[PDB]
């Protein structure tokens, strides 16, 4: 997805998401039905 769609889904930038721990990245992907 686009940078704008990413920010809408996750409410943060891709760089912000990458600073999260893996467990939380994975948690968010599942919560949102993505990836
Ligand atoms: Na929106």
């Amino acid at each position: 997805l686009s940078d704008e769609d990413f920010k809408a889904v996750f409410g943060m930038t891709r760089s912000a998401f990458a600073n999260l721990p893996l467990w939380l990245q994975q948690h968010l992907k599942k919560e949102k039905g993505l990836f």
Side-chain angles (χ1 to χ4, degrees), residues 1-23 25-35:
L1 34 64
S2 77
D3 287 3
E4 282 250 325
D5 310 311
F6 189 99
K7 286 179 271 259
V9 173
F10 296 105
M12 64 188 71
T13 62
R14 291 167 192 279
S15 49
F17 189 84
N19 180 61
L20 291 174
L22 188 58
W23 71 256
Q25 293 173 33
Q26 292 305 69
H27 178 255
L28 292 175
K29 282 165 168 189
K30 296 183 188 68
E31 169 197 15
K32 309 312 204 169
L34 278 192
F35 305 125

